Design a protein around this ligand. Structure first.
Ligand SMILES: [Zn+2]
Ligand SMILES: [Zn+2]
Length: 75
């Protein structure tokens, strides 16, 4: 009865699985907001960074795409 679900790490907020999006290699969970404001900034550039998981402490540190991402934001 009642429990701190939690999920995202960039904001350690509280949200279900339908309110989040997977990375693309490590299979992590991050609310669009963060997972977005983070990449949305880089994805737009493309100069470098390769947009890596927002979890510097990720056991897989999976990277993200430049299109697939910008597609979920800058369609
Ligand atoms: Zn978040
Ligand atoms: Zn990760």
């Amino acid at each position: 009865a009642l429990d701190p679900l939690v999920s995202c790490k960039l904001c350690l907020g509280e949200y279900p699985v339908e309110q989040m999006t997977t990375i693309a290699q490590c299979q992590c969970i991050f609310c669009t907001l963060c997972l977005k404001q983070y990449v949305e900034l880089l994805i737009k550039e493309g100069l470098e960074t390769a947009i890596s998981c927002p979890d510097a402490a990720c056991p897989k540190q999976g990277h993200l795409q430049e299109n697939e991402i910008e597609c979920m934001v800058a369609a």
